[PDB]
């Protein structure tokens, strides 16, 4: 149209790799362990 642009992906320079995310496994499973500690006291004698 008159005076409007539209921005799009033109090209990719280089190799093509995977977009991702990284968490530490030790810290995350320690966090899940502590959440399980706090969560067993609301559902006693059960495995979550």
């Amino acid at each position: 149209g008159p005076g409007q642009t539209f921005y799009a992906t033109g090209d990719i320079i280089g190799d093509i790799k995977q977009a991702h995310c990284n968490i530490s496994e030790e810290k995350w499973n320690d966090t899940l362990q502590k959440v399980g500690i706090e969560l067993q006291k609301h559902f006693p004698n059960k495995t979550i």
Partner: antibody
Framework: QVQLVQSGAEVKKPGASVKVSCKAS????????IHWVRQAPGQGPEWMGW????????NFAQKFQGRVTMTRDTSISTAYMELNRLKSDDTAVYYC????????????????????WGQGTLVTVT | TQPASVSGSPGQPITISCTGT?????????VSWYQQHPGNAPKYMIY???KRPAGISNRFSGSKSGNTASLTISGLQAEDAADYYC??????????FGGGTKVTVL
């Protein structure tokens, strides 16, 4: 010990095409990039391009576009170097080099870690 | 850019420099150094800005100052008369070289 085997001499008239074959041994073809180095006699080396051996995506230099194609075969673990419309300045030594480690999470294609070099080939244009 | 040749007596260090633009060496520390004997493939002893692979002693040492990268050869011997090339990453997944330097060991 890993090793790279390159093709023999290629003597032909200008205007034709040259295929250079590079065969790897001692390591799997999927894990590493393959780069190409062209060295004119009495002149320094010149980078030519890289190929992702895991998928076949390749890139060339800024002034070799339209003349150069990269192919490979992972079954027999080799790469092919096709150059079209050669000129008299294309008489040079061609080297197949092993680059960085191919990883799916970060672009290590442009790393100039040329670990192992092949024996090279000579291309003479009459 | 690279000096054409350097000369030196045995038993003393020498330096070979490579000065490039900010996009070549200033932005990215990917610089490498190879030597090439005549009638032979180029060798492999510097890959990162300072690192060395296995099988290479402390004869060679790389460094980067600002916009240039210099390789220092601590001591000299008659084996070190090969032609030295520096190489770097120029951006946009494009790799460039230096051009060459001939070492004349006395």
């Amino acid at each position: 010990q890993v090793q790279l085997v390159q093709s023999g001499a290629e003597v032909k008239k200008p205007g034709a095409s040259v295929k250079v074959s590079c065969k790897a041994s001692g390591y799997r073809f999927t894990d590493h990039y393959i780069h190409w180095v062209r060295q004119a006699p009495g002149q320094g080396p010149e980078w030519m391009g890289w190929i992702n051996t895991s998928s076949g995506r390749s890139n060339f230099a800024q002034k070799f576009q339209g003349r150069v194609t990269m192919t490979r075969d992972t079954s027999i673990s080799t790469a092919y170097m096709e150059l079209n419309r050669l000129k008299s300045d294309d008489t040079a030594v061609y080297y197949c080099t092993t680059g960085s480690w191919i990883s799916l999470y970060y672009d290590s294609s442009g790393y100039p870690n040329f670990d192992y070099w092949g024996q090279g080939t000579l291309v003479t244009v009459t | 850019t690279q000096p054409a040749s350097v000369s030196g007596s045995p038993g003393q260090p020498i330096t070979i420099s490579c000065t490039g633009t900010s996009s070549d060496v200033g932005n990215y520390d990917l610089v490498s150094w190879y030597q090439q004997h005549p009638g032979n493939a180029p060798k492999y002893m510097i890959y990162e800005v300072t690192k060395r692979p296995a099988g290479i002693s402390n004869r060679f040492s790389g460094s980067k100052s600002g916009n240039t990268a210099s390789l220092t050869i601590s001591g000299l011997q008659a084996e070190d008369a090969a032609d030295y090339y520096c190489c770097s990453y120029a951006g946009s997944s494009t790799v460039i070289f230096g051009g060459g330097t001939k070492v004349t060991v006395l």
